[PDB]
Design a protein around this ligand. Structure first.
Ligand SMILES: O=P(O)(O)OC[C@H]1O[C@](O)(COP(=O)(O)O)[C@@H](O)[C@@H]1O
Ligand SMILES: O=P(O)(O)OC[C@H]1O[C@](O)(COP(=O)(O)O)[C@@H](O)[C@@H]1O
Ligand SMILES: O=P(O)(O)OC[C@H]1O[C@](O)(COP(=O)(O)O)[C@@H](O)[C@@H]1O
Ligand SMILES: O=P(O)(O)OC[C@H]1O[C@](O)(COP(=O)(O)O)[C@@H](O)[C@@H]1O
Ligand SMILES: O=C([O-])C(=O)[O-]
Ligand SMILES: O=C([O-])C(=O)[O-]
Ligand SMILES: [K+]
Lengths: 499, 513, 516, 427
């Protein structure tokens, strides 16, 4: 047992790399995959959120499919209270990002659970009269132009795909309806969505998970609503249907990142094909260097049990091996009985899978597919990661203001952690979207001599790395800086020993 | 689109991932075998027939529970459902019977004939007076030498890993434990002692009766629970003796010692099962995927069957649709290189045994198309040594030829299955149609990825050349009827130069007549 | 056989593992083409050329008459049939006809064929097309046979005479005259070759002289044609039509010796049966520092296409006058084989040199060494990666047999073939083991030398009545050939390729059998 | 352009198929040219033409000749070299190499498959240290003891003189690993090597020694008979052209000319041909495979200079940089960059004149001798030397204003602290 699966990292083939995986080779830590947890009744309290952060929650997700604005406002206030409870020591302080998940073009049912028999008959009524008198033969939908977008012989899936219209069971109240095959004329940004996004920018959110993004214009519509006041809010496009998968290329280019929303995608396309769409979207985002999130049902059984299933354990690890920048928890942290155990489990799995990555092939294929550029920062990023592998550096220290220089380093997936020193608090929170970036917010005021002010932030990362066990005095690290203040000038790579 | 063949011709693994297409329909022939545990929800002849039609290849009997009378009837029901299709040998699908041994299990007593509290006090005693009298305060387990294996504050898990304890005080015939993770206790629950060394024998006195029962019931394979060393496999082999010398022994690796000594266990085994259920308790659950990918790769390297098992579609016990994690697990096990995937409670006792079998079938077929054959075939060859066996050279030549012509199938005539096993080791994309007159060979063929066994019941022809061609034409008709290929396509045919095992040396690229 | 360097994971350490103490196998896979001339024309010398390793005899039709060439062909066929007493060790020898082509030659120096003049650099020289000076050239006026030499060369052009050794600068141009200034001088002889780089030489690709030479080749039953100065694919079609129906099985080798032939190489190779990198004229028509680029480009493209490629000209040039080559020439032989050249050639080394046999032996020695040094692991992988999927059962059987040959490290791949296609499809994937190609067609046994690794063997036994017994006779004939020539011994594992019915195009059966 | 289409091929076979004779190479020739100086090129005026035609190292064959004669050849070499010193932007350093006579039994030349440095070798070696030669071609080196024997003879006075051993027999090939570890480089002396071992095996030992030297990051010279026919002819043979190109493709840092420049009839033509072929073959190398295989076999390091070097080569491929500018005092930092064989030329700025002359032994290093005085502010003195390299690349046509280049410097003055890589445009 060497460490960090380094015996397997030196295998000439991927098959031999698999054979040399050792359960007794413990991970030289620094977890390089971000953990996003949806907040709900089980995790809304300040004391709970403090434990979630200590257990490894890097992004708090707000699902605007439910709850009011004042409800989500207290959640945000609770998240910032729990996060700022560690701000007394900036060396150990961990930024925590806030994410708004839009409701999007949803389709619900009416009120009163009944019992749907297989082969029975139910008259789907887009009639506001029976909006509360739903039985076993008269179901109501809130979709305008449902009769136009549907064709005879097609299928309809109510309550997260449980009932099929066919295979149906106990139909509840106000359950979601999925209409695969697509034709949904519902707007990309609804009236509720517009007010939610305007609420998000008012609340200084860090990122937006846009639901049911079908085409590239949907992301432009979302970015237009965020306006100039929220122009720095990263837009993560959720791919949840067939149209989003086919139009993924134009969606990826218009978006800041992608979430593989496997829950709705598992209903819109055959569930046996979800792994295809996941490994495809993760590969293309890794190719383009944009964040990708694997979400939904990763540790589903932990909603009721303190330990996950074997399938759930492998799913989290395989999402990391796929190359996902972040993993997500929904009901496991929003409503389950073991939110802290779900967060801790994803942290332990991610750390093991990060060591089991075949870096030798990944780094070669990432450069082989990346184009030649004239951006000096991009060339500095490859040279830094190449140097980091060459000397087994304890970290790559990147001074960045917008996060860009750190993102360009993370695109090439170094094994060493990326310590991104920034004075921009939003940049530090947003850095969690990119694999391997450990953001550190330096609150020290700006010095007069610019060379000394850069030396300050470098030494800040040194103490942070020594305090968190990333390296020790005398170790080699890679330091990325630029030639003048302001963003966009990162061009200097140094190999320096830590003091 | 078709077959993920645009992704199959990528220069890098990353580009291969980028070219994965949900709109490219899969092959047709599912290569990864499906093993289903037969239990109350599936042991009926009517259900078993639909299990076979849904894709079940191996019927696994878990001897951790049930009597020999109960298992004999289940086996009888499996063969009644299987022989229900024996009238048309062209469409007849062999179905193997697997015996899963109890092994060195540690079980608890019977609750009165409860519900533990989180952080309470649980006294674990060996006094047999509390065996049929278990309460929330006194707990009896059948591992007599328990205190001579556990120490201070040792973690001890009950109820398939759910309830967790901590030996707060020791004793000689009792143990005082403080609950670390509460939960509703039960009767006759399994107990794991991770980080300790149980001294129970590899083959218990009960396993002797079940292994002898398996021989007289003509089972095709034994799943030996809790193998730790090569000598455990030899013990199972010696116990089976001459009457069970052809029964294949699958070593179930479910603890730290089995993983540590996997190489010697694999060398002595006929195959391996990644029994993730117990393994996820004996070692940290976040490390299971490492042990699975290690054992699958090593078994692929050695050309030996590997089974990924336990909790693959666990939520389907109660729901007609699996979770996304379960959808990825089945797909990733196939992509890892597993010859077989298994279902336990999903088929033995769950509410949707047929939906679980169908889901594994659909996922496995999709995953098989998504395999990066350009890298896999290249890496399996560079790692396999140069050989003098003509069958090995013919097998890899047949696989290379099947990739070159995009063959509809690789037809293999075999008595023992070996020649077909040697083809599957190189993982062709095309299905391997192994024609045989040995019914046991046809059932045992399901252990190897891609082998579609067909049982030839035609009488032996007078001229050997005619008997060979009769069996080749049987595979032709089978592939045509099963939709594997059509007339005009090219298939590879593997025969030998003389009758008897061990002479396969002839590879022919023939058109489908 | 450099087996340690063959198991390396990288090309670099494969080079580091190259061992001068690891001996090669017996079978030399690279064909040797020997140009026959005054030093190699006799039946006695030709016998030793075959014993030294000659597989193809080249006849350069730029000089000589039909009767002189017919007697050379007769002496060749006599020297090879001298060994027809033992069909086990009988090595076939092909005959190749190198066309004259659109050549530009000067007149005679002072009415003599042997006289020479010394051109001093910087002086002047008049080039005229008036036939009155065709036999009266000197250091002042030079005659050449290209009539349109003025309507193709402008002022400042550079003319090269005698293998590009003499260079002229076209100072002033005339209607039928050409005023030049000598750049590089020296001895100017009679009837020397003239190269006009960068000029559109409008000479016919198939002149009337070549038309009769090709008709002579058809009548003399030549195996292949080396077509000089192929500029486009239509030039290969003209050669194809002249050979007509009677010369249909005569393989056409397009000689790339100009800038246009390199630029239009794709359409030429697709219309050709083979390619020769004729570096002599190529080194003059294009800069000499670019010849290796054209050589590696053409060798790789024909390796990718599965068509024969030949490395020619000045490979052991110093051996014309000396019994041992230079280090550069020894390096050029091995690098040609390492490049992937199906055959290496000798021109003046065997045509007129003082050591024709030593050059043949030197080429055979270096080829055997470079064959073992080939990175088969990367070559076979890259050849399969770039070859398309096929619906032909023979091609799938060929790559399967080669793949099986690497798995067992077989002594050989025995291939029964009538037209040679079966053996060519095996050689296309470059197995390490020799390809013993059994045939009853004498022409295919001669044309098989054009493909690397094919050891052609002509069976003399009569066709047995039972076809399955006639196959085993030919199969066991190759076993005798392999055991005799030391390619393998009893107990060794070999690959044997047969078909399912007589006639060409049915090879589909691969058998892994031990040597009886 | 410089076979850029062939460089982007996914396979080595497709890389050959893409080699285009119509894709012109860059003006920067990375392979050093060593010319043996003799009667045909001893004059001051031709030595100027030899330099103008691309000569980088002047080899003095001590198998014959006296010290008063070889010192006059050196003086003329330094005379012709310093004739261009009136312009440090275009000045090219020219190295001086002493090839020892060694155990040479003679009155022709006898070979048969003896001391390392006998009395004649020591006197000539001491004359080399007195004449301030940059390197010594130790003739016939059979074991590492011979290299130590020679290194002890040069002493601490010539401790910086680079000992590069000439492998000339079967023993040196078998004991090559211990010889290479004790040497500063290797010359594959193909002349004597072709006699001691079968001629058909010379290419085996050549590619063996070049690959191992490439692996170890030590210079290797391919020597002798590369253009032999040019001794009496103005154009080489096709085999000689392919030999020059294949040596460069093998990975040889320098190519050599012996009789072609020493006594041949076309000295300048032989130097020009080696120049033209070298740059054509440099564009034809499969950098995609070479860079990967060089790193796969290079071990993990803890030296900041080695990590900065491979990071700079990786960055230079990423931006297709015009050059890798490396400030170096001993040349070592430029040597570590050249070990990973970048496509871009390595402009090694130095003030040490010997470091500049010795840099010709390493592929891709273009040494420039900075004559400007040291500045008080060290940061300004660094930018001055960086600006010197920028003006050199523009004047010599290696790149133009606006092009991207990699600049390697260190964090403090003194040798051994190169650790800073900057990606900067050309002003
Ligand atoms: O990642 P970004 O947005 O390009 O920021 C990197 C910037 O940080 C710096 O290192 C220092 O910038 P500041 O001093 O303004 O914070 C610059 O050299 C560089 O341009
Ligand atoms: O895989 P196995 O057990 O070695 O069997 C393959 C055998 O089957 C055959 O194809 C047919 O032999 P039989 O006629 O005895 O069935 C033999 O040529 C070959 O040896
Ligand atoms: O290579 P070719 O010209 O297609 O011929 C190969 C043929 O040789 C054979 O092995 C024997 O054919 P013959 O008996 O007619 O000579 C056939 O089975 C096969 O089709
Ligand atoms: O390559 P070398 O010989 O180690 O020298 C490189 C050195 O040059 C420097 O750039 C400065 O050189 P100077 O001492 O001449 O100013 C150092 O930073 C570095 O250590
Ligand atoms: O026995 C089993 O199958 C297990 O533990 O997973
Ligand atoms: O014709 C030839 O062979 C040549 O030019 O090399
Ligand atoms: K199937």
């Amino acid at each position: 047992i060497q460490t960090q699966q380094l015996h397997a990292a030196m295998a000439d083939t991927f098959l031999e790399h698999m054979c040399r995986l050792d359960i007794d080779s413990p991970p030289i830590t620094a977890r390089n995959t971000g953990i996003i947890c949806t907040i709900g009744p089980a995790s809304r309290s300040v004391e709970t959120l403090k434990e979630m952060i200590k257990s490894g929650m890097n992004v708090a997700r707000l699902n605007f499919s439910h709850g009011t604005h004042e409800y989500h406002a207290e959640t945000i206030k609770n998240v910032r209270t729990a996060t700022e409870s560690f701000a007394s020591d900036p060396i150990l302080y961990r930024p925590v990002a806030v994410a708004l998940d839009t409701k999007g073009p949803e389709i619900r049912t009416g009120l009163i659970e009944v019992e749907l028999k297989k082969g029975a008959t139910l008259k789907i009524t887009l009639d506001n009269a029976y909006m509360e008198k739903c039985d076993e033969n008269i179901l109501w939908l809130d979709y305008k132009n449902i009769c136009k977008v549907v064709e005879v012989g097609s299928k309809i899936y109510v309550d997260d795909g449980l009932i099929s219209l066919e295979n149906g069971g106990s139909l509840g109240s106000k359950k979601g309806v999925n209409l695969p095959g697509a034709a949904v004329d519902l707007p990309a940004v609804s009236e509720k969505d517009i007010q939610d996004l305007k609420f998000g920018v008012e609340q200084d959110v860090d990122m937006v998970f846009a639901s049911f993004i079908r085409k590239a214009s949907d992301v432009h519509e979302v970015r237009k609503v965020l306006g100039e006041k929220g122009k720095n809010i990263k837009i993560i496009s959720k791919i949840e249907n067939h149209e989003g998968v086919r139009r993924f290329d134009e969606i990826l280019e218009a978006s800041d990142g992608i979430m593989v929303a496997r829950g709705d995608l598992g209903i819109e396309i055959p569930a046996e094909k979800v792994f295809l769409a996941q490994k495809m979207m993760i590969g293309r985002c890794n190719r383009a260097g944009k964040p990708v999130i694997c979400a939904t049902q990763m540790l589903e059984s932990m909603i009721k049990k303190p330990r996950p299933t074997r399938a759930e354990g492998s799913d989290v690890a395989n999402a990391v091996l796929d190359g996902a920048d972040c993993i997500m928890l929904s009901g496991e942290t929003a409503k389950g009985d073991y939110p802290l155990e779900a967060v801790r489990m994803q942290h332990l799995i991610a750390r093991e899978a990060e060591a089991a990555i075949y870096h030798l092939q990944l780094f070669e294929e990432l450069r082989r597919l990346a184009p030649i550029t004239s951006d000096p920062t991009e060339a500095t990023a490859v040279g830094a990661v190449e140097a980091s592998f060459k000397c087994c550096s304890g970290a790559i220290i990147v001074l960045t203001k917008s996060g860009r220089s750190a993102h360009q380093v993370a695109r090439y997936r170094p094994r060493a952690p990326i310590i991104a020193v920034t004075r921009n608090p939003q940049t530090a929170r947003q850095a969690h979207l990119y694999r391997g970036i450990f953001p550190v917010l330096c609150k020290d005021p700006v010095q007069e001599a610019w060379a000394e002010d850069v030396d300050l932030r470098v030494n800040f990362a040194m103490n942070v790395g020594k305090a968190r066990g990333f390296f020790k005095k005398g170790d080699v690290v890679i330091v990325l800086t630029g030639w003048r203040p302001g963003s966009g000038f990162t061009n200097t790579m140094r190999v320096v020993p830590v003091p």
